[model samples]
Target: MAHHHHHHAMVIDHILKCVFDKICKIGTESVEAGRLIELSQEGGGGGGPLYFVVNVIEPCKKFSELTGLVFYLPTDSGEKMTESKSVLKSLTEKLKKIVELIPSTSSAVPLIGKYMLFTKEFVESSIKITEEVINTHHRS
Candidate 1:
């Protein structure tokens, strides 16, 4: 069995290394959900002014450093976005609070399953949304 290990490195550095391991990258592109959110006039019935949004999601700061991440939204979105972000944050907290752990190499024994299903479903959703938006926006 693979042994458990401990890593106490900076989160960004650590994750970047793992990503660059295969020579890739990871960034939210300064937007929540890691991608641009744009709404077009093609949809929603010849809408008035065809609204555009930078999607200022309610932001959360990191623990160790780098408060560059911030909260943003139009005044109207503020109340609803705050509620949504807070609820989502709470949900993530609960997951981590109950998820598996690794104490030591020889003594480690935490059970977790269903990862493949979760990963596949999440990946599928990401591709669907990204492609749909990109295709819609690129129409000339």
Candidate 2:
């Protein structure tokens, strides 16, 4: 990844950690309950229920005008549902707050460097959360 993306990636990881934490706290049952009904399955038999997996996508052709920050949480199966919209909306607002915490700088170079550092930290924390989730689910 480019040096500039390091920061944004970090921020994205941090936001994901927060989201996962909230989900874990609510428990698997809650997460299942909250899932959008339409996206419940990928199709056909023998498939597992879809999950709300989150990730960031690259910028489109209008990259210049875009800030390049993205958060996508698609259901396990490829379906989209209105119920997921509210969860995504709420998470977007929280992500905005996390992004705001990043320090602002007028100099592009220094800003990018700082963002990388901050993002590294965030990503590390996110990894921890991922481990926790795995362990928790396994134990249960």
Candidate 3:
């Protein structure tokens, strides 16, 4: 007869909705599946590096903004610890990968998801690769 709320109980539907809301705020127009295919064909050879770059960048920027907010609430402001935990709970590997991929340049770059060939799993792998490259630069 005890009720317990788990940290990992975030609904995927809700998370996706939040993601779409953020995407809309950034003025990204979601094309239909067929349109996406057309875009891929017209852009590059479809599923090339250029497409990946475009797809991943925007989401990465959005997630970086969200993570910065999370970082600020508990560290800078007088936010409660429980609130901080909630923000942390909302982060996912997808967000982390995208955040890692965003370049720190003024020029526009393709996001990892933009490539026609990359699925969610591919993005995560690319993030790992990107992180390693970044770390190597720091070490050099």
Candidate 4:
């Protein structure tokens, strides 16, 4: 029994774009996982944020455009939010270490799972909070 179900989109366009840029820049190596999360934080960190945003903006913006809509990270995360949370803590340290190691020599998917876990946790947290902000708009 084949049913032609209507396609459904779970995400809003504006917020979906945020998720898109947030995740893609990581997968494409345009943004370091540490820098992105640090930048995305609402409190906003030290001068480090300015440097990374300035350094990474053009490249990551271009990355967000040309290679936008990558899907690999979600599969890497496997929807395990607790594991995602734990891995995010490890990410800052590992990212600092591996950023040098990953610069050259060769390429692979070895640490990609970690990158995706960062992205996945980032998505869930940001998306949940954004929805609340949107709700505030409705209440106002």
Question: After superposing candidate 4, which stretches have Cα over 4 Å from the reference?
Answer: 1-12, 30-116
Please identify model 2 stretches exceeding 4 Å from their true place: 1-17, 20-112
Clashing pairs in 1: none
> How close to the true structure is residue 120 of candidate 4, measured as C-alpha lDDT?
45
Across 64-136, the per-residue lDDT of candidate 2 in tens digits comes to 1111122243232212222233333444454344334442222442333343243223323423434543444
* Candidate of highest TM-score: 4
lDDT of each: 0.26, 0.34, 0.37, 0.43
Provide the TM-score for each candidate, comma-separated: 0.21, 0.22, 0.23, 0.28
Better of 1 and 4 by lDDT: 4
**Residue-level lDDT tens digits of model 3 in 56-108:** 55445554454334223323222332342333234334543543554332221
Candidate 1 per-residue C-alpha lDDT over 1-140 given as tens digits, one digit per residue, 9 for 90 to 100: 11232221333233323322321111232222211211221122122321111111222222101111111112331233334334434534534432243122221112112321232233233223234333433552
Q: Whole-model lDDT, candidate 3?
A: 0.37
Residue 6, model 4: Cα distance from true site in angstroms? 25
Candidate 4, 15-46: lDDT as tens digits: 45665565655555535565444334432333
* lDDT measured at residue 105 in model 3 versus the true structure, 0 to 100: 25
Error of 2 at 74 (Å): 11
Q: Model 1 compared with the native: what TM-score?
A: 0.21
Number of clashing residue pairs in every model? 0, 2, 12, 0
